[PDB]
Amino acid sequence: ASADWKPGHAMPSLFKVQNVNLERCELANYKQSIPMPRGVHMNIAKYMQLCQYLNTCTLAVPANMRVIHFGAGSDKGIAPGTSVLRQWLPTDAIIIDNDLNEFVSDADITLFGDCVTVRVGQQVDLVISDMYDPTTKNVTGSNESKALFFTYLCNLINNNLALGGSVAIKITEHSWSVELYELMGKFAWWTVFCTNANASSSEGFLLGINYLGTIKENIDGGAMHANYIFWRNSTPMNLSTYSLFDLSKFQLKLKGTPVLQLKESQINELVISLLSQGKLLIRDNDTLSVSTDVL
Amino acid sequence: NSSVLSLVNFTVDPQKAYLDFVNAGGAPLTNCVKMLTPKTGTGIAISVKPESTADQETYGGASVCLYCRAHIEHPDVSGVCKYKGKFVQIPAQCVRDPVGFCLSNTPCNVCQYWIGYGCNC
Ligand SMILES: C[n+]1cn([C@@H]2O[C@H](COP(=O)(O)OP(=O)(O)OP(=O)(O)OC[C@H]3O[C@@H](n4cnc5c(=O)[nH]c(N)nc54)[C@H](O)[C@@H]3O)[C@@H](O)[C@H]2O)c2nc(N)[nH]c(=O)c21
Ligand SMILES: Nc1ncnc2c1ncn2[C@@H]1O[C@H](C[C@@H](N)CC[C@H](N)C(=O)O)[C@@H](O)[C@H]1O
Ligand SMILES: [Zn+2]
Ligand SMILES: [Zn+2]
């Protein structure tokens, strides 16, 4: 099927507008595994498909692009996702990655420890999170909004994300946050994206495209997660990596997006329109300083 | 992995200890980060983006560096790893042990291709 050649599935407005109770997620192919092309790690394909989808989005892509990647490490002590980001992003992009446990990576800066220890001195352009807390597997009682690392990420979106910047944050059926869904309403556009390489998981990447710093859509976060699960329960997704068969255009377009400093007073309709089309970032243009704090 | 990695911490010559280990039948270090690429690159050894030809595979550089993978001191006089943050092209006939391939070989300082596997100087 055509969808098997796409990098994955994006939550459609058909399901965003629903009004339903939160139900258990029941995927027909749950936990099936796709053999991997060339035997690369599964996360190579997953991250490549997320990048391919973001290639269709209005991402801001400036010189010296500031990218932070949380949950970058593995039990194997390596970071396949970070290498994919290095392959995808402009060569002058700055990649900072982080994980609770020690690992080695191709990032420019690597920080170990809880993401709460990561001090972002200046605003960034793109946040990727693959964090997941193992205690989420200990499902007891009802599936309520989680705190965990989501408190940190929500504060980061409100304070340390450039206007025009974007986020891709991994959620699952039980690993999710009301507050993060509501913050998607402060972007020009948003969705949940599910890779074909991991279609048999309730994993999705909650995507916020072009941060506006103001409410564009009023979202009820609890109801929206219920809509996400309703979508997953209604939508056949077959495991596939066919989208990776042709990689001639995989690299992120070198858009040259300008970075401007503006006071809030000066943000008019022209500026908002440029932000919403991926044509402008607003933040400092100093040197980025990201370090480990002592808490 | 946990063994050969443990091993190169009990010696003053990690490169020799790794190579002797795999030359004597020991299992190469696994979990090197092999990328998926259009095999349409220039074929040079170390590159800012993947450059595999049809006869090569590309790996993330940190993952094929013994010193990175074992978290030990790099030997370069600059202190800067030659691989980390870049991509490393490995001949397809050598993918059984990318770490050992890198320990065993040097890119041409003039043409940047692997001596013996691409350099035509
Ligand atoms: C969707 N679904 C959930 N359950 C049930 O509800 C529980 C919580 O789900 P959950 O929110 O983990 O989501 P899953 O998709 O398992 O995530 P899955 O793909 O595992 O997780 C994605 C991420 O999990 C992460 N993960 C698992 N172990 C660890 C760990 O030890 N440490 C860390 N950091 N991450 C882990 C890993 O990062 C992976 O990429 C599940 O365990 C099932 O009991 C389902 N049961 C049935 N029968 N059918 C289903 O369709 C179904
Ligand atoms: N609070 C946290 N701060 C930093 N990392 C976290 C936190 N919670 C979970 N993680 C990391 O989330 C990661 C989840 C991994 N599955 C992600 C990496 C994935 N295996 C890969 O393809 O690279 C684990 O390595 C965790 O240590
Ligand atoms: Zn190294
Ligand atoms: Zn030469």
The answer, yes or no, to whether any atom of ligand 2 lies below 6 A from the CB of A71, is: yes
Q: What's the CA dihedral at A228, A232, A234, A238 to 10 degrees?
A: 150
Residues within 6 Å of ligand 1 by CB: A 25-27, 30, 132, 134, 136-137, 139, 172-175, 201-203
Tell if the CB–CB gap between B85 and A86 is shorter than 8 Å: yes
Residue type, A78: I
A102: tokens are 């020690």
Q: Kindly give, in sequence order, each residue whose CB lies less than 8 Å from that of residue A167, ignoring residues fewer than 6 positions away.
A: A126, A127, A128, A129, A153, A157, A161, A187, A206, A207, A208, A211
What's the A33 CA to ligand 2 centre distance in angstroms?
A: 20
Q: Is B121 annotated as a binding residue?
A: yes
Q: Does the beta carbon of B31 lie under 8 angstroms from any beta carbon of chain A?
A: yes
Reduced to 3 states (helix: H, G, I; strand: E, B; else coil), residue A137 is helix
| β-strand partners of A111 | A98
A54: tokens are 């973001």
A267: tokens are 């943000």
Contacts of A44 in chain B (CB under 8 A): 33-36
Contacts of B54 in chain A (CB under 8 A): none
Tell if the CB–CB gap between A39 and B34 is shorter than 8 Å: yes
* Top mutation candidate among A25, A47, A131, A149 for ligand 1, by most atoms within 8 Å of CB: A25
Alpha carbon distance A131, B6 (integer Å): 28
**Which residues, numbered 55 to 84 in chain B, qualify as contacts with chain A under a Cβ-Cβ cut-off of 8 Å?**
57, 60-63, 65, 68-69, 71, 84
Residue type, A192: V
Are the C-beta atoms of B37 and A44 separated by less than 8 Å? no
Q: How far is B120 from chain A (nearest CA, A)?
A: 27
Domain housing B13: 1-121
Strands (E), A124-186: 124-129, 161-171
Are the C-beta atoms of B91 and B101 separated by less than 8 Å? yes
- Compute CA distances A169 → A134, A205, A265, B58, whole Å: 17, 5, 31, 28
- Compute CA distances B106 → A26, B44, B88, whole Å: 53, 11, 12
A101: tokens are 């446990």
Q: Is B81 annotated as a binding residue?
A: yes
Are the C-beta atoms of A117 and A110 separated by less than 8 Å? no
Per-residue 3-state assignment (H helix, E strand, C coil) for chain B: CHHHHHHCCCCCCHHHHHHHHHHCCCCCCCCCCECCCCCCCCCCCEECCCCCCCCEEEEECHHHCHHHHCCCCCCCCCCCCCCCCCEEEEEHHHCCCHHHHHHCCCECCCCCCECCEECCC
Domain housing A1: 1-295
Radius of gyration of the CA atoms of chain A, in A: 18
Residues across chain B: 121
Are the C-beta atoms of A105 and A84 separated by less than 8 Å? no
Number of structural domains chain B divides into: 1
Neighbours of B40 (CB within 10 A): 12
Contacts of B51 in chain A (CB under 8 A): none
Residue A54 Ramachandran class (φ > 0 left, ψ -120 to 50 alpha, else beta): alpha
Are the C-beta atoms of B34 and A39 separated by less than 8 Å? yes
- Ligand 1 atom closest to the CA of A100, numbered from 1: 34
Are the C-beta atoms of A69 and A128 separated by less than 8 Å? yes
The answer, yes or no, to whether any atom of ligand 2 lies below 6 A from the CB of A135, is: no
Helix residue spans in chain A (DSSP H): 2-5, 13-16, 42-54, 80-88, 150-159, 178-183, 221-234, 269-276
Number of the ligand closest to the Cα of B31 = 2
Are the C-beta atoms of B89 and B56 separated by less than 8 Å? yes
- Ligand 1 atom closest to the CA of A71, numbered from 1: 34
Tell if the CB–CB gap between A106 and B50 is shorter than 8 Å: no
Q: Which of A132, A118, A122, A210 is nearest to A174 (CA)?
A: A132
| β-strand partners of A109 | A96
| β-strand partners of B14 | none
Q: Which residue has the tokens 């090197």?
A: B32
Contacts of A45 in chain B (CB under 8 A): 36
The answer, yes or no, to whether any atom of ligand 2 lies below 6 A from the CB of A81, is: yes
CATH of the domain at A30: 3.40.50.150
Number of structural domains chain A divides into: 1
Technique employed here was X-ray
Alpha carbon distance A23, B44 (integer Å): 53
* Number of H-type helices and E-type strands within chain A: 8, 12
Helix A80-88 / helix A42-54 crossing angle, nearest 10 deg? 30
Alpha carbon distance A239, A221 (integer Å): 28
Neighbours of A285 (CB within 10 A): 14
What's the B86 CA to ligand 3 centre distance in angstroms?
A: 10
